[PDB]
Write a protein that binds this ligand. Sequence first.
Ligand code: GPP
Ligand code: GPP
Ligand code: MG
Ligand code: MG
Ligand code: MG
Ligand code: MG
Lengths: 317, 297
Amino acid sequence: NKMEAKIDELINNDPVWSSQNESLISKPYNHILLKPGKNFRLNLIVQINRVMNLPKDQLAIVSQIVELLHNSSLLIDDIEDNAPLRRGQTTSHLIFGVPSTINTANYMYFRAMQLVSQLTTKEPLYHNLITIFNEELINLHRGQGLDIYWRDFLPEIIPTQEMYLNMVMNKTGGLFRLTLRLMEALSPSHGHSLVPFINLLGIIYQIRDDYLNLKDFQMSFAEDITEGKLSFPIVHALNFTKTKGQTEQHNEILRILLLRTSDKDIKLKLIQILEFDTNSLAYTKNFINQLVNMIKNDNENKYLPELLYIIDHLSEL
Amino acid sequence: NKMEAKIDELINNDPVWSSQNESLISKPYNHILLKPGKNFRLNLIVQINRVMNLPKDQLAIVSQIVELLHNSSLLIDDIEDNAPLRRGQTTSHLIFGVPSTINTANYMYFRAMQLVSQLTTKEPLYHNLITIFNEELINLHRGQGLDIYWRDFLPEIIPTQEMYLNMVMNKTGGLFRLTLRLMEALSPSSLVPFINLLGIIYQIRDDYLNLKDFQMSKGFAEDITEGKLSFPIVHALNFTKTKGQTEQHNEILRILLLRTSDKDIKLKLIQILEFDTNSLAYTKNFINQLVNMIKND
Ligand SMILES: CC(C)=CCC/C(C)=C/COP(=O)(O)OP(=O)(O)O
Ligand SMILES: CC(C)=CCC/C(C)=C/COP(=O)(O)OP(=O)(O)O
Ligand SMILES: [Mg+2]
Ligand SMILES: [Mg+2]
Ligand SMILES: [Mg+2]
Ligand SMILES: [Mg+2]
């Protein structure tokens, strides 16, 4: 009778959720907020609004959405890559546990989704916005999915340079495109689609990330090696040795990646294979320079609409 | 040039994705499809439809949506719960790894969202359906978030019965209400409260049999191994606190925090609930009262 009352009261109302609960579930996410870089992301949005000109109000929601997805994908990525550190501080899963961190990351994907219906009340443009959201999140997952698959099934498949570019288009292009596409759809104005340029951007960004992880270490943790990642320099190297018939160095690269080693001496050995044998770091520094020139020597603004500036500090988005 | 030309063809096209790739990343999910239960969910979708009168085309798409959401939920939940088995089979994360399983499950959440647009060509309705989809998935994660937090940080928070039921309304109620609300919005013809009570009965009976089955044989009482704040455990913990059974309250916590698979230790915990806190009898009677709230409707 009193129990039935309380039950009937419970089931006739919306599920209870307090802000103390919100705070609990938010701890793993809030922890990654301490990580810097929010400005270089924001700067890229700002700079881009000069072409799209979204009403400051609207630009902020787009910004919050982007932040949520970006930070959430990183929380997940660190669990998937078993990373002990991010932007120098301890990763969330190591503090709040893998359980809570996955759940919080996933919760924020859907919170981000909710922020979408607040960009416009126009029913047709709403659909477009959700579709854009849906599609790019699907691409991000396909790309991350292949990145993980090749790493975890090695040495079953060894990606070619081209397979890798297709992976990055999905993986790193997803959020770049998502941000750009939302803005172009909300633009009250602006010229050619700036997507090809945001694509080139994502690509440059990922190779440089793959590059600097090995270079910073050479000149002085190179986690990518410990992770066993088919990064750009590695794909080059594996394909070079197979092509040049260098069986030993090929297998030697495979063996080090498969060790999932934290050993600095072994780490160096692979980098030395990469400098002296396949010259892959040099090859990669070059490849990036050319992608960058495709935007620098863009006189007929085929890709272009300050961008030179972002492109150089791109490593901190 | 050839490189610049190749970079140019790439950036001016949609990302390349093949059925081979699709295939490779669906491995974790295809594995869980083997497991049963799929027909009762359809049976439940079907029964409710005797009321909702949805055309069979649309009913099929709601089923597909719900199955994808549920199975993905299970893939993740087993990672979160460190579960070795599901429906008597090895969990995907132990076969394909935690990384691919987390990615594929999340991938499938978005494939499900993508299917919502196959339900209508009418914008006003579309918007409602997406909102429902969005709202319940937010509820589901809030629920899951408390269940995981209370457990992984025990004894930081000792939930009360009222708190457990709020968690369950979000967590279990989330998928029940998702199906029903989408069906109710597609009806050319609410049962929300009833679906909420069905969810709660569902959850408490599930918690209860996990322990009872093992006390009797039949089951592994894996909830103890997980350290879960189940309905019988929540009753025992508040009963002990309130009745001043310090040692017992503490032994319950200690056993939960062992994450043990020792049968005698789990049996000792269960017998504490049976003879000391009488949490089992209590859960049984509570389940019965709730079942009466329907059968007596
Ligand atoms: C579906 C998900 C979670 C996608 C993640 C997308 C992303 C920004 C990954 C980062 O991994 P990375 O290979 O670029 O390495 P890092 O840790 O340096 O960013
Ligand atoms: C946001 C997420 C992932 C929600 C999970 C939804 C769900 C069905 C969980 C299982 O709970 P349980 O672990 O208590 O039951 P089981 O015995 O099926 O593992
Ligand atoms: Mg990573
Ligand atoms: Mg990664
Ligand atoms: Mg669970
Ligand atoms: Mg579970």
